[PDB]
């Protein structure tokens, strides 16, 4: 017997434990699948996806008590009950007062699952939750305060249905969730929820990954995006690959406590073009460029916070403004320009300004194809969105071309029989 066919767990030098291929895998080949050990649908998607299986279907039947959880049918409603029961009564009890973070919501479920199924599940053939790395020793004061705030939230919102271990076990658990947790994104990379996929969590990070993680409802799937030879280590990406090496590494050091040493981080080849400066008479002095990089990266965070307090028109003004100031130094193909154009596109999509979003997207797509890997969902989702926009605006030729560009990547990443693919082909035939 073998826990996962054609693969094995091993000690990756300088990267703790990892996943190794035992046999060859080719582009689009499925390495393995992993059912979710625990998962939670994001609040915003309630009524759009089944709480149990995540099927996106219309006329889902709601729960009689909380009227917040929606399901395919009674079987899905009943199957989900051991988990839903942790929130059902509380969302009624705490009204709008019920605002647990997503992570806290996930951790409650993990605690629940540990209680119901203490033995290894089918989602833990190579790596078990109890084995998750935590980096407790590297956690600073602030991160620790944040974890205690999360623990406090967990007690506040979950105490009657879930028994808790001592404080240190919770610190460890939240710390493991932080460096082994996943987000589930749909075909457009829209946030659906958070989950734990233990065998998937075994794979180490690279900025030029050879596999892609996708989801089929709540089932995690791992497919090759490059050739994988026997004995080779299997690498996925934990983060958005668009940003320059320093940014990626600031995030990886910040969230996962390591500095990536992959080829892209060593050579930094994509960095010149990611940070493209525009060719002028002067040209821009180095100091000014370093200054624009600090400004851009500052505006990224300002923008990220402002989504919470600003109106769409204002966020748009931030984007137009920022792009204008940065365009003095930066070329349009530069990733910091693109981040803002992308955000602006998102605002346009929110204000239902399809034409504006399409105008941003057409401008975003090409530089994206350069900055991201050959098969990237970030690119595929963009082609898909562009395609659906064309299709919705009755421009069928461009719609078909964009949908075909999205499909070509998605067949590799999701597999030819994935329901999203059938959906997109079914969108073209109309």
């Amino acid at each position: 017997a073998e826990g996962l066919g054609g693969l094995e767990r091993f000690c990756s030098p300088g990267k703790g434990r990892g996943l190794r291929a035992l046999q060859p895998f080719q582009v689009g080949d499925l390495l393995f699948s992993c059912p979710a050990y625990a998962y939670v649908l994001t609040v915003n998607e309630r009524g759009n996806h089944c709480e149990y299986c995540f099927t996106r279907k219309e006329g889902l039947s709601k729960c009689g008590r909380c009227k917040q959880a929606f399901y395919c049918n009674v079987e899905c409603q009943k199957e989900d009950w051991p988990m839903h029961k942790l929130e059902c009564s509380p969302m009624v009890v705490f009204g709008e007062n019920w605002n647990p973070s997503e992570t806290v919501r996930l951790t409650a479920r993990i605690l629940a699952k540990q209680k119901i199924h203490p033995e290894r599940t089918p989602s833990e053939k190579l790596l078990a939750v109890k084995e998750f790395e935590s980096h407790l020793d590297k956690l600073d004061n602030e991160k620790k305060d944040l974890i205690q705030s999360d623990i406090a939230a967990l007690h506040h919102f979950y105490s009657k249905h879930l028994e808790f271990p001592d404080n240190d076990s919770l610190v460890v658990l939240f710390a493991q969730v932080n460096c082994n947790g996943f987000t589930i994104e749909d075909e457009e990379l829209s946030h659906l929820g958070s989950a734990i996929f233990p065998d998937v969590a075994l794979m180490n990070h690279s900025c030029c990954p050879n596999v892609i993680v996708t989801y089929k409802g709540t089932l995690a799937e791992v497919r090759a995006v490059q050739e994988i030879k026997p004995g080779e280590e299997v690498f996925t990406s934990y983060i958005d690959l668009l940003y320059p090496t320093e940014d990626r590494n600031d995030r990886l050091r910040d969230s996962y406590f390591f500095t990536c040493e992959c080829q892209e981080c060593t050579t930094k080849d994509k960095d010149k073009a990611k940070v493209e400066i525009r060719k002028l008479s002067d040209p821009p002095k180095a100091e000014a460029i370093r200054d624009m990089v600090r400004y851009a990266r500052n505006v990224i965070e300002e923008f990220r916070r402002a989504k919470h307090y600003k109106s769409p028109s204002e966020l748009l003004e931030i984007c137009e403004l920022s792009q204008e100031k940065m365009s003095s130094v930066f070329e349009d193909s530069n990733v910091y320009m693109l981040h803002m154009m992308y955000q602006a596109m998102g605002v346009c999509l929110y204000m239902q300004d399809w034409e504006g979003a399409l105008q941003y997207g057409q401008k975003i797509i090409k530089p994206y194809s350069k900055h991201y890997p050959l098969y990237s969902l970030n690119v595929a989702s963009m082609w898909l969105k562009l395609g659906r926009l064309y299709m919705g605006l009755e421009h069928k030729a461009a719609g078909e071309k964009a949908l075909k560009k999205a499909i070509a990547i998605m067949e590799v990443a999701h597999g030819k029989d994935h329901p999203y693919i059938s959906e997109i082909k079914q969108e073209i035939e109309s």
Partner: peptide, 10 residues
Amino acid sequence: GRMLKHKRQR
């Protein structure tokens, strides 16, 4: 940021 494993920076 403070995100879990993700493809698109939210």
